[PDB]
Ligand binder design. Sequence first.
Ligand SMILES: O=C(O)Cc1cccc2ccccc12
Ligand SMILES: [Ca+2]
Ligand SMILES: [Ca+2]
Length: 124
Amino acid sequence: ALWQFRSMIKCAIPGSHPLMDFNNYGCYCGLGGSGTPVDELDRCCETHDNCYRDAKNLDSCKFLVDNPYTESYSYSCSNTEITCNSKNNACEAFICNCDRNAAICFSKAPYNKEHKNLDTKKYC
Ligand SMILES: O=C(O)Cc1cccc2ccccc12
Ligand SMILES: [Ca+2]
Ligand SMILES: [Ca+2]
């Protein structure tokens, strides 16, 4: 679920504040997305967006309000290590891995201040 993804980021990148840092970054980090990502970080977000897309299109999963963000899994954090609980059902595991892969990705992408709150009507 959304809150848990926020905590994943705090786990992968300890000195970080997610809502502020990664929301409305580039073209994909934020609600929806458009165009080509600008950045490796932005790419991390596009892949996340696509991961949620695929999850919605697993005909065996029916998320509340049709939003995968709505779905909790369990997962733990041990010194930069995110671990998805094996006991999460197939749909929760999938979402879990979207979030975790995205937090691992964010932790290795260059953060470019330029791109925070990008003019998306122009550059995306
Ligand atoms: O996925 C989204 O729609 C927005 C979104 C994207 C990336 C990181 C985030 C961190 C905290 C809250 C929202 C976030
Ligand atoms: Ca997005
Ligand atoms: Ca759940």
